[PDB]
Each structure stands twice: as structure tokens, then as C-alpha cells.
Amino acid sequence: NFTISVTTEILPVSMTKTSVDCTMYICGDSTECSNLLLQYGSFCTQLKRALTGIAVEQDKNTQEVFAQVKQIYKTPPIKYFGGFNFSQILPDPSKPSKRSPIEDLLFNKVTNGLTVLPPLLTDEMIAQYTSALLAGTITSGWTFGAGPALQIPFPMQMAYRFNGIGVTQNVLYENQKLIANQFNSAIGKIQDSLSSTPSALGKLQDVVNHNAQALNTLVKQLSSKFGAISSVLNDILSRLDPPEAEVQIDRLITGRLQSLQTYVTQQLIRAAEIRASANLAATKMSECVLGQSKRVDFCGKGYHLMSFPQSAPHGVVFLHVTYVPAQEKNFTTAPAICHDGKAHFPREGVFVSNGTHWFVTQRNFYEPQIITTDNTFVSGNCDVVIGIVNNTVYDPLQPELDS
Amino acid sequence: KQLSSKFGAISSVLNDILSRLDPPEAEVQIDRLITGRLQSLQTYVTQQLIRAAEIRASANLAATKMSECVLGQSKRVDFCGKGYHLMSFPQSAPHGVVFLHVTYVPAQEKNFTTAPAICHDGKAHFPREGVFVSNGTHWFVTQRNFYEPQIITTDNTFVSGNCDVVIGIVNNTVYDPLQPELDS
Amino acid sequence: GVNCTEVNVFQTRAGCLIGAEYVNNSYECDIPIGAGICASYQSIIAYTMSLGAENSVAYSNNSIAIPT
Ligand SMILES: *[C@@H]1O[C@H](CO)[C@@H](O[C@@H]2O[C@H](CO)[C@@H](O)[C@H](O)[C@H]2NC(C)=O)[C@H](O)[C@H]1NC(C)=O
Ligand SMILES: *[C@@H]1O[C@H](CO)[C@@H](O[C@@H]2O[C@H](CO)[C@@H](O)[C@H](O)[C@H]2NC(C)=O)[C@H](O)[C@H]1NC(C)=O
Ligand SMILES: *[C@@H]1O[C@H](CO)[C@@H](O[C@@H]2O[C@H](CO)[C@@H](O)[C@H](O)[C@H]2NC(C)=O)[C@H](O)[C@H]1NC(C)=O
Ligand SMILES: *[C@@H]1O[C@H](CO)[C@@H](O[C@@H]2O[C@H](CO)[C@@H](O)[C@H](O)[C@H]2NC(C)=O)[C@H](O)[C@H]1NC(C)=O
Ligand SMILES: *[C@@H]1O[C@H](CO)[C@@H](O)[C@H](O)[C@H]1NC(C)=O
Ligand SMILES: *[C@@H]1O[C@H](CO)[C@@H](O)[C@H](O)[C@H]1NC(C)=O
Ligand SMILES: *[C@@H]1O[C@H](CO)[C@@H](O)[C@H](O)[C@H]1NC(C)=O
Ligand SMILES: *[C@@H]1O[C@H](CO)[C@@H](O)[C@H](O)[C@H]1NC(C)=O
Ligand SMILES: *[C@@H]1O[C@H](CO)[C@@H](O)[C@H](O)[C@H]1NC(C)=O
Ligand SMILES: *[C@@H]1O[C@H](CO)[C@@H](O)[C@H](O)[C@H]1NC(C)=O
């Protein structure tokens, strides 16, 4: 017996783009600031160029993770996909933001001179891209990330997914109601569990809190004396005498520029880490969604069947579909079957004997079939295989060549 | 270009300050100049390490694609090229590499009417590797990515179960070659 | 990010846009601005982003498509 479960794996994509007013943050409304700062060469153009490059890289990451298709597919008006309840996943038009209930739950759970830029792709367009991707991986199979989309009925696509993991498709067609009920129960369970557990949104909350704290500590550093006389421009450039005021304001702007350089270096390193995570999420979107990936523990714990992405604030969330077998059963095997002085070997599976009778079965499911010469290929003779057992093999057409 | 910055000093030439002012003030001027130039050099080195880390990540990705799309065939969907994968070649470029992925794009489709199983003689038939495709009157089994139809035979189908458990089954005959073989 | 009530003019959800008229039609993005506004030289116009053609595909219970 097999149990189908859905698991969550959350990956951030992009943080908030930032732009800094350089000479306004250093010191504003002072000609002495200008004639002391423009003689520092270029310690400001470098910072502005690096931060704008970071913003462009965040835009590129947002474009790369979600815009893997050049079409906006629309779901068919039929809501009967074969008994599967695609209502917590496929978006509905009654909501004002055109978002799925899981996206709504995830968005509701997640909660001078420094300027925060807005992203190019707003959340409505990200939700539209995810709706198009769900339409593509429901009604078109996996043959739409490679060429044009093709109509595939959903039970046959799911049978293809079972055929991808070494299990014959017929076990789907004798268990369709059970698979549909298990999938719907798993979807409802994960919908409840995304709200029941409070610490299931670590990465997105940590990245937005890190951005907020790194932006707050700069403004906190704006009001420190840095070993100078004071921390106010109108106090240091009016009460003092310019022979010492020039040195004091040079020390103060040197400290402020050092703090700004530290902030830019921290933002560069965090953006590099976010870029690596976004590349990993793009690989996940290209493999675990647009097709089946046979490698273990990259698209969910267990054998992988499909996955559905959902839009998230400052990132993406994945809902994998995994095939987890259970209900083990002990048996006695043999590497080969001996018959008439020649050995037989299984074509697709393994020779399994419960008691005094032998059967051939597929590898990941118990389906006993009578040993025929259409389930075996002969090779060599019966004196060298270690552990071979004696048993007759059914020939095909026995009662037919003499009738 | 940072050499021509005064850094709050009198000038940006070390020979000029040392040959025009007394050493008590020249010490302060050269100290400010040397700490400014040292800060500039540290900033350049930090930028170089960041860019080198990014280039290291990109070069590891390039070696990944070279080992997994030139030395062999990759079954990962949309990892090398837009479409199904065949093979690829590397070409050398200054300070980089350029691949030429060779892909397989199955355009010009034509849709049909299908069914997951065929019922005959009280038992259900399932396709071994293809899909049951009907063009309206007869039935055929064809490949999953190229429409080359073949007549249904017992040698490319496997039987399991009966006609009642599976849904969506249809009724059609199946060709068994032993019936035209036995009478001859 | 400046509400230009003190300094043709079309107001985006990114600040003020001066010198670019607004067109209700939509085209492919060339120069990104933010909040789903992209401007291109057709004069200079600013339009809502086009995500692509609405290539809807049919679906049934027994319809399959095979390339030839
Ligand atoms: C395989 O396991 C599933 C559940 O893990 C079984 O489905 C349950 O079956 C019992 C009785 O057999 C019912 O009372 C439950 O309502 C079923 N649950 C669901 C969700 O449908 C299934 O019967 C098992 N199949 C085999 C062959 O053991
Ligand atoms: C999917 O499962 C739900 C579980 O009950 C079905 O019922 C919906 O339940 C939610 C929350 O309990 C309500 O907000 C909806 O209004 C319910 N739907 C209806 C039609 O009343 C839901 O019907 C199932 N969907 C399908 C397509 O079977
Ligand atoms: C091992 O399993 C096989 C098949 O499940 C059993 O073979 C059948 O068992 C039933 C139950 O008595 C008999 O009515 C059939 O005649 C058996 N088939 C054949 C071809 O002999 C087999 O009995 C099981 N082994 C044990 C020790 O129980
Ligand atoms: C469906 O395909 C079959 C096989 O290609 C077609 O059957 C053949 O049709 C041609 C054209 O009239 C005849 O010359 C052949 O003798 C037919 N072969 C047979 C009957 O085995 C069939 O016509 C196609 N159906 C439609 C509606 O196009
Ligand atoms: C199978 O046998 C092993 C020992 O050989 C035992 O530990 C295990 O519990 C058995 N499993 C079942 C399902 O009986
Ligand atoms: C039964 O198996 C044993 C061990 O493989 C072998 O020695 C013996 O000849 C076999 N009996 C036959 C083939 O009748
Ligand atoms: C699918 O087939 C039907 C008739 O069988 C036809 O009306 C429809 O246009 C076809 N779909 C496509 C995309 O060609
Ligand atoms: C197939 O034949 C059986 C037995 O005559 C019948 O019950 C069933 O309705 C038939 N199905 C179709 C699709 O004709
Ligand atoms: C700009 O300010 C006016 C008056 O306060 C307000 O009505 C308008 O909505 C503001 N613009 C935006 C884009 O909110
Ligand atoms: C598919 O099956 C459902 C279930 O009854 C039915 O409502 C729908 O009309 C069917 N679709 C077609 C195209 O016949």
C-alpha cells in the first residue's frame, strides 16, 4: 500500500531594493560638506553604482524565478479534473486580489534619506504567473515547458507520473478513488498546517527582519558623535571656529562614510546569498514543476510525482507531491529460476515466493503474476548462478498449439 | 584615479608636501593621505573578493553544465536548452565559455480522442509503452512524442484486472497473430 | 516616490512621471520602471506590462494531442 503526502519547502527569491541619498545621508544643507566631500575622490559613486547593480540583480532574480513561460494559460471552466479537488490551489475570481486560499493565508500570516524602491513585478502579476504555471502543469502535462502545450487528461498524466518512477500505470486505474481521496485529504491537511504551526515561515520573516534591522541600524548610527565635538551639523559648524571645525567635520564624515561602507558591504553579501537561493529556486521551478525529476530528495522526501508553486511575499513556496510506500511484507526471493538446465532472469522485477509457489512482481508494488517466458529472458545454463532454485515456468500457448 | 584626491590635505603629491612644509605638519598630512589611500585599497580588495566569489559560483555552474550536457545526455527538463535535450558542444570564448545546445522541439500537433484502456474478452488491456489513440473510427497505439500509429497487438500490451474496476474503458477488438498463424 | 502636487504628467505607483503620456493599451516591456509600468518609444508612452498572449488551451476527459 502507498501513501501520498504533500510537503512544504519555502525559498526566498528577492528582498526589497534599496537606494541611498549619499551626500544627503553624509551631511545635508552645508557648503562645507560639499567642498570637503567632493575632494574625497569617488567614495560615493562606487556605492551608488554597487547598490543600483544590486537592485538590477534583484529584478533579474524576480524575472528568472517566475517568468519561465511566455504564455498566460487560462484554466478550463470545468472544475472536475478526475476527482481531484483543485480548489485550494487553482485561484478563484471571487477574491479581489485573484489569489488562491493558500497564497492568501501565506500573505496574511507573513507580517533620513534612505529610500526603498518598489519592485517591477507587483504581487498581482506574480499571482498571474503562478496561475498560468498551474494551468500549464494541470491541463497540459509536462509537455509545455518544451515546445507548445498539448492537451492531456489528468488521470492519464498521473499514470504517466507513476510510470516515471518504475511502477506500471495499471495500479492507478484500480485505485483512482483512493488516490483522489488521499490527495484531497493531504491538501486539506497542509492547508490547515500552514496556519496551525507558527514557526513554518522562518526564511521570509528572517530576510525581511534582517533588511529592516540593517536599515534601522544605519539611522541609529546617524546620531553618534564618532569622537568629534558633537553630532549636529548646525552645532558643529556654528559654535566652533573653522580651523578646528574643518578637522572635526572631517572626522565625523569619515566615520559616517565608514558606517555607510559597512552597510553596503553587508547588503552585497546578503544579496549574493539571496542570488544563490534564487538560482536554487529557479532550478527547482524548472525541474520539480516543469516535468518530473527522478533524483531522490531534491523534489520532496520520497519518489517525486509533481509539484505546485504558490506566490509568496518576497519569495516562493512549493507544494510537492510525494509517493511514500508503506505496509511492508516479508518474502523469500531468489536471483534466478532453474528450468530444463537453463536459467531464467526477471525482465522488470524480482522473483518472489511467499510459500511453496513463485511469482514475478514489479519492484515497488505487490502484483503476483504467473512466471511466463514473457516475463523472463534466458541466459547461459544452470550451474553458475549462486542461490538458484528449481521451479517450472509456464509456457505461453500451451493449450493452443494442440487444440 | 584615487591617487589624485587631496583627502582633506593640502595636495595629493607626497613630494610636494615633504618639500614645502615642516615635518610636524607633514606628518599629519601624510597620515591623512595614507589612511585615505589604504581605505581605498581595502574597498577595491573587498570588491574583488565579492566579484571573485560570484565568478566562482558561475564557473562551478559552467563546469556542471559542461560535465552534464557535453560528456553525456541530460534528462533534466529545461537545464540545457529550451526543449528536449539531444547533445551540446562547447566553444571557447575570451574569459568564458559558450555552449551550443541542440534541442528537440515537437511542434505542429494534431489532437485525437483517447481512452486509458481497451476491453476485450472480459479482460482489460493496457499499453506497454505508448498511448491508445483513436482518430474517430478505429483505434491505434502510438508513441508519446511522435504520431506513428500501429495496430493494437497482444505483443505490445499487457493485461491486468477485469473490465469493471477501471473507469473510462472502451470496447474494441485486439489483434492476436496466433489466430492467423494457427490455421496456416 | 514623490507625489507631485507641488513640483503631460501621469502619476504612477512609483512617484511622478513627467513627459510620458499614459496609454490604456498594453505592450511588451522594454524599459522597466516599477509597479508594473514600462515605457518605450513607439513620442514616449508608458503602458501597463503585457505578460504575453492569452493562449488558452481546451480540456476534456478523453482528448489528447500528439505531435507529428
Ligand atoms: C491503503 O491505505 C488506505 C489508507 O492509508 C486505505 O484506505 C482506507 O481503508 C479503510 C478500510 O480498508 C477505510 O475505512 C478508510 O476510510 C480508507 N481511507 C481512505 C482515506 O480512503 C486502503 O484501504 C488501503 N488499501 C489496501 C489494499 O490495504
Ligand atoms: C474541496 O473540498 C472542500 C472541503 O469541504 C469542499 O467544500 C468547500 O469548503 C470550503 C471550506 O470548508 C468552503 O469555503 C467552500 O464553499 C466549499 N465548497 C462548496 C462548493 O461549497 C469543496 O467543495 C471541494 N471542491 C471540489 C471541487 O470538490
Ligand atoms: C502464496 O500465494 C499464492 C497466491 O496468492 C497462493 O496460491 C493460491 O492459494 C489459494 C489459497 O489456498 C489456493 O486456493 C490456490 O489454488 C493457490 N494457487 C495455486 C496456483 O496453487 C499460495 O497458497 C500462497 N502460499 C501459502 C503457503 O499460503
Ligand atoms: C483513421 O485512420 C485509419 C488508418 O489510417 C483510416 O483507415 C484507412 O483510411 C483510408 C482512407 O480512406 C483507407 O484507404 C484505408 O483502407 C483505411 N484503413 C483501414 C480501414 O484499415 C481511417 O479512414 C481514419 N478515419 C478518419 C475519420 O480519418
Ligand atoms: C520481517 O522479518 C524481520 C526479521 O527477519 C522482522 O524484524 C520484521 O518485523 C518482519 N516484518 C513483518 C512485516 O513481519
Ligand atoms: C534442484 O536444485 C539443486 C540446487 O540448485 C540442484 O543441485 C538440483 O540438481 C536441482 N534438481 C533438479 C534440477 O532436478
Ligand atoms: C481538438 O479536436 C477538436 C475536435 O476533435 C477540435 O475542434 C479542436 O480544435 C482541437 N483542438 C486544437 C487545439 O486543435
Ligand atoms: C462493452 O461491452 C459490455 C458487455 O457487452 C457492455 O456491458 C459495455 O456497456 C460495453 N461498453 C461500451 C463502451 O460499449
Ligand atoms: C497626492 O496627494 C493628494 C492630496 O494629499 C492625494 O489626493 C493623492 O491621492 C496623492 N497621490 C497619491 C498617488 O496617493
Ligand atoms: C467529463 O466528465 C464530467 C463528469 O460527469 C462531465 O460533467 C463532463 O461533461 C465531461 N466532459 C466532457 C467533455 O464530456
PDB file of N, CA, C and O in Angstrom, chain C residues 1 5 9 11 13-14 17 20 27 34 37 39 42 45 51-52 54 56-57 61:
ATOM      1  N   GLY C   1       9.089  58.059  -6.041  1.00  0.00           N
ATOM      2  CA  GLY C   1       8.309  58.159  -4.817  1.00  0.00           C
ATOM      3  C   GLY C   1       8.015  59.563  -4.330  1.00  0.00           C
ATOM      4  O   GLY C   1       8.142  59.835  -3.130  1.00  0.00           O
ATOM      5  N   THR C   5       2.362  67.136  -6.275  1.00  0.00           N
ATOM      6  CA  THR C   5       1.335  68.150  -6.094  1.00  0.00           C
ATOM      7  C   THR C   5       1.926  69.527  -5.834  1.00  0.00           C
ATOM      8  O   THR C   5       1.172  70.487  -5.642  1.00  0.00           O
ATOM      9  N   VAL C   9       1.567  65.106 -17.383  1.00  0.00           N
ATOM     10  CA  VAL C   9       2.014  64.482 -16.144  1.00  0.00           C
ATOM     11  C   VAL C   9       1.059  63.344 -15.809  1.00  0.00           C
ATOM     12  O   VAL C   9      -0.158  63.551 -15.737  1.00  0.00           O
ATOM     13  N   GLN C  11       0.575  60.089 -12.980  1.00  0.00           N
ATOM     14  CA  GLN C  11       1.013  59.625 -11.671  1.00  0.00           C
ATOM     15  C   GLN C  11       1.039  58.101 -11.649  1.00  0.00           C
ATOM     16  O   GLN C  11       0.012  57.454 -11.882  1.00  0.00           O
ATOM     17  N   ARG C  13       2.354  54.389  -9.527  1.00  0.00           N
ATOM     18  CA  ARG C  13       2.633  53.919  -8.170  1.00  0.00           C
ATOM     19  C   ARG C  13       4.131  53.708  -7.971  1.00  0.00           C
ATOM     20  O   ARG C  13       4.586  52.695  -7.443  1.00  0.00           O
ATOM     21  N   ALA C  14       4.904  54.702  -8.404  1.00  0.00           N
ATOM     22  CA  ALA C  14       6.333  54.765  -8.145  1.00  0.00           C
ATOM     23  C   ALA C  14       6.807  56.188  -7.904  1.00  0.00           C
ATOM     24  O   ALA C  14       7.997  56.388  -7.642  1.00  0.00           O
ATOM     25  N   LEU C  17       5.743  60.904 -13.050  1.00  0.00           N
ATOM     26  CA  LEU C  17       6.261  60.674 -14.395  1.00  0.00           C
ATOM     27  C   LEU C  17       5.900  61.881 -15.249  1.00  0.00           C
ATOM     28  O   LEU C  17       4.717  62.142 -15.496  1.00  0.00           O
ATOM     29  N   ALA C  20       5.776  61.710 -20.266  1.00  0.00           N
ATOM     30  CA  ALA C  20       5.331  60.454 -20.853  1.00  0.00           C
ATOM     31  C   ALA C  20       3.840  60.303 -20.607  1.00  0.00           C
ATOM     32  O   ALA C  20       3.407  60.198 -19.455  1.00  0.00           O
ATOM     33  N   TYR C  27       1.690  46.703 -24.104  1.00  0.00           N
ATOM     34  CA  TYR C  27       2.703  46.135 -24.983  1.00  0.00           C
ATOM     35  C   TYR C  27       3.781  45.476 -24.136  1.00  0.00           C
ATOM     36  O   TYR C  27       3.759  45.536 -22.905  1.00  0.00           O
ATOM     37  N   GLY C  34       8.794  50.213 -12.473  1.00  0.00           N
ATOM     38  CA  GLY C  34       8.382  49.698 -11.179  1.00  0.00           C
ATOM     39  C   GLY C  34       6.871  49.728 -11.077  1.00  0.00           C
ATOM     40  O   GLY C  34       6.200  50.533 -11.725  1.00  0.00           O
ATOM     41  N   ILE C  37       4.839  49.277 -14.580  1.00  0.00           N
ATOM     42  CA  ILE C  37       4.834  50.325 -15.592  1.00  0.00           C
ATOM     43  C   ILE C  37       6.103  50.177 -16.417  1.00  0.00           C
ATOM     44  O   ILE C  37       7.204  50.105 -15.861  1.00  0.00           O
ATOM     45  N   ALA C  39       7.892  51.753 -20.108  1.00  0.00           N
ATOM     46  CA  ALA C  39       7.804  52.796 -21.119  1.00  0.00           C
ATOM     47  C   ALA C  39       8.726  52.482 -22.288  1.00  0.00           C
ATOM     48  O   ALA C  39       9.836  51.978 -22.099  1.00  0.00           O
ATOM     49  N   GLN C  42       7.478  54.468 -29.020  1.00  0.00           N
ATOM     50  CA  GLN C  42       6.676  53.875 -30.085  1.00  0.00           C
ATOM     51  C   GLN C  42       7.022  54.473 -31.443  1.00  0.00           C
ATOM     52  O   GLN C  42       7.655  55.525 -31.532  1.00  0.00           O
ATOM     53  N   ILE C  45       5.629  56.748 -24.652  1.00  0.00           N
ATOM     54  CA  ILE C  45       4.401  56.350 -23.979  1.00  0.00           C
ATOM     55  C   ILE C  45       4.749  55.404 -22.841  1.00  0.00           C
ATOM     56  O   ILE C  45       5.784  54.732 -22.859  1.00  0.00           O
ATOM     57  N   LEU C  51       2.020  40.452 -20.122  1.00  0.00           N
ATOM     58  CA  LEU C  51       2.637  39.201 -19.709  1.00  0.00           C
ATOM     59  C   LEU C  51       2.684  38.168 -20.824  1.00  0.00           C
ATOM     60  O   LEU C  51       3.323  37.125 -20.653  1.00  0.00           O
ATOM     61  N   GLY C  52       2.031  38.431 -21.949  1.00  0.00           N
ATOM     62  CA  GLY C  52       2.004  37.528 -23.076  1.00  0.00           C
ATOM     63  C   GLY C  52       0.598  37.338 -23.597  1.00  0.00           C
ATOM     64  O   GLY C  52      -0.371  37.897 -23.087  1.00  0.00           O
ATOM     65  N   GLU C  54      -2.870  35.434 -24.267  1.00  0.00           N
ATOM     66  CA  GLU C  54      -3.735  34.538 -23.501  1.00  0.00           C
ATOM     67  C   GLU C  54      -3.989  33.291 -24.342  1.00  0.00           C
ATOM     68  O   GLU C  54      -5.029  33.126 -24.986  1.00  0.00           O
ATOM     69  N   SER C  56      -5.089  30.249 -24.194  1.00  0.00           N
ATOM     70  CA  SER C  56      -5.899  29.255 -23.507  1.00  0.00           C
ATOM     71  C   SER C  56      -5.951  27.969 -24.321  1.00  0.00           C
ATOM     72  O   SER C  56      -5.979  27.997 -25.555  1.00  0.00           O
ATOM     73  N   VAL C  57      -5.960  26.838 -23.625  1.00  0.00           N
ATOM     74  CA  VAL C  57      -5.972  25.527 -24.258  1.00  0.00           C
ATOM     75  C   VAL C  57      -7.162  24.742 -23.718  1.00  0.00           C
ATOM     76  O   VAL C  57      -7.496  24.834 -22.532  1.00  0.00           O
ATOM     77  N   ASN C  61     -12.274  15.075 -20.990  1.00  0.00           N
ATOM     78  CA  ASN C  61     -11.938  13.835 -20.305  1.00  0.00           C
ATOM     79  C   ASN C  61     -11.274  12.809 -21.210  1.00  0.00           C
ATOM     80  O   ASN C  61     -10.668  11.860 -20.701  1.00  0.00           O
TER      81      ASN C  61
END
